[PDB]
Every structure is written in C-alpha cells, then in structure tokens.
C-alpha cells in the first residue's frame, strides 16, 4: 500500500547507475527519506539498489 | 628499443558501422536503413528492399517488425498503420 525508503549508505564510490536510480527515487542526501506507494515499478528500483536503502511499511 | 626484430602483421581496415539501425516498434520513415549487412543475414520482407550493398531499407512509412522465415532465417517487414 504505502512504504518508506531511506538512504542509509552513501552514494559515493558507487557506479553512476546506482546513483541515478537513487536520484529517480527522489532521495537527496544520506539518511534522507521519502514515502511512496507500493508499486512494482518502485519495487524494481528498490530491489536494484536495496544495498543502499531500507524499507518500511509506512 | 630492441633493434631489428620486426613483424609482418600490423595492418587492418576501418570497421563499417553495420548491424541494426532500427528496432521493433519504432516509426521509420521510408528509406530508413534497418540493417546494414553482407550477404543476407536478414532478407527483405513486406515493403522492404535490398540495396546493392545488401542494405535493407523500408519502402514506405510505418512500423518495423523483425520475424522468422523458415527454420533458421530472418526477414524484415514494415506496416503502415500509424
């Protein structure tokens, strides 16, 4: 339904791909966060860069 | 810097940017090259022609679709509804 994503790891030292994905999710700085609606399109991006972020059911 | 030792193979040509030029699903205008080749990796199909250089170009406007011919060949088609 609704989930919460926070950038827990830094984006320095990661390929441009992973940083672009992080840009697409709308996360700006380390430990920044956003709330978006559960959606296979969004899950595709979280799964691609799960090692930098974390999820919550909020 | 060594001396007299010399090799008889330091030569090559300029590669030709062959291969695909359009994909399944995009609107090509007529004349658009779809696949520059040698011999026939892909034969022309509907509304597609064969250049002198084995080049494949659309006859008319439309979408492009790659398909199978028999058991191991490929052709190309163009369809106009747009």
């Amino acid at each position: 339904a609704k989930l919460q994503i926070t950038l827990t790891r830094s984006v320095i030292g990661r390929p441009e791909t992973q940083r672009k994905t992080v840009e697409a999710l709308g996360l700006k700085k380390t430990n920044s966060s956003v709330v978006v609606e559960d959606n296979p399109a969004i899950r595709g991006q979280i799964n691609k860069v799960k090692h930098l972020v974390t999820v919550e059911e909020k | 810097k060594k001396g007299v030792s010399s090799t008889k193979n330091g030569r090559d040509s300029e590669s030709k940017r062959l291969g695909a030029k359009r994909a399944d699903g995009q609107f090509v205008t007529g004349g658009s090259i779809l696949y520059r080749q040698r011999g026939t990796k892909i034969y022309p199909g509907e509304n597609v022609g064969r250049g002198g250089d084995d080049t494949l170009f659309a006859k008319i406007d439309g979408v492009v679709k790659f398909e199978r011919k028999g058991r191991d060949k490929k052709q190309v088609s163009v369809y106009a509804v747009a």
């Binding site: - | 810097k1 060594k2 001396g3 030792s5 010399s6 090799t7």
Partner: protein, 137 residues
Amino acid sequence: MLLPKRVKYRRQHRPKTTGRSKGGNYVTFGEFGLQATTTSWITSRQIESARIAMTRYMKRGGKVWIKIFPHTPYTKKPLEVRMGAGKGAVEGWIAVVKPGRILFEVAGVSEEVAREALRLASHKLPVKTKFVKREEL
C-alpha cells in the same frame, strides 16, 4: 604425447586457467586412475617423465592410457631483449589441467602396483593429484 603434428595458428593466446574440468572426469579405459586437484599447465617433458616413472614400476605388466594431450603452444622471447617488437617463438607445448581431470589410467595390474606407479608419476608432475578407481554403482 609430446607434440601436435601440425597446428593451424602457432602463436596462440595463452589458455584460461580458472574454472572446472570441462570433461574427462571419469575412468573410461582403465581400472585405477589419477585425477588432479589444482590447476597448472602440464608440459610435454613432464608427461613423458611421469610416464617413464609409472611404467618402469609396473615392469611392462599392464596397459597405460595418457588422458592429457599437450595441444597448446607457448612462446618465450629471446634472451636479453626489450619489450615489444613482436611475439616470441614457440618454446613448448602444453595442455591445461584443472581440478578434477584424470591424467593417467591403468589396467591389467594389481591395485597396489597401480597405486605405487601413479604415486611415482605424481611427483614428476606439477599438480596435486588423487588416486581413483573405475567409478561404478
């Protein structure tokens, strides 16, 4: 089991030595055999040498099958030369072994004699080995 009689191209890119045995992992001809557990390049002089050792011990009793053939040529540049100016000339023929490959097969001789012969062969050889019997069951 020394050299290919002819090859098309004689200066070949060196072989990949990372992974597992594509095949030849079973005793097909022999009764007891010898497989490898590391990887190295095995040269013709080493194979010939391990063979003489094995077959001196068996005292011309039973048969032997060498399962590795030296196919790849290798190059070495002439001495005291700088870098560049082409590729060097062929110095020997090789055949890459990787963990699992059987290197020698034997039959028609008792088990202990075969094990001793393959032991003596193992020391003339640059790869860790293992004694194996014809897989059954």
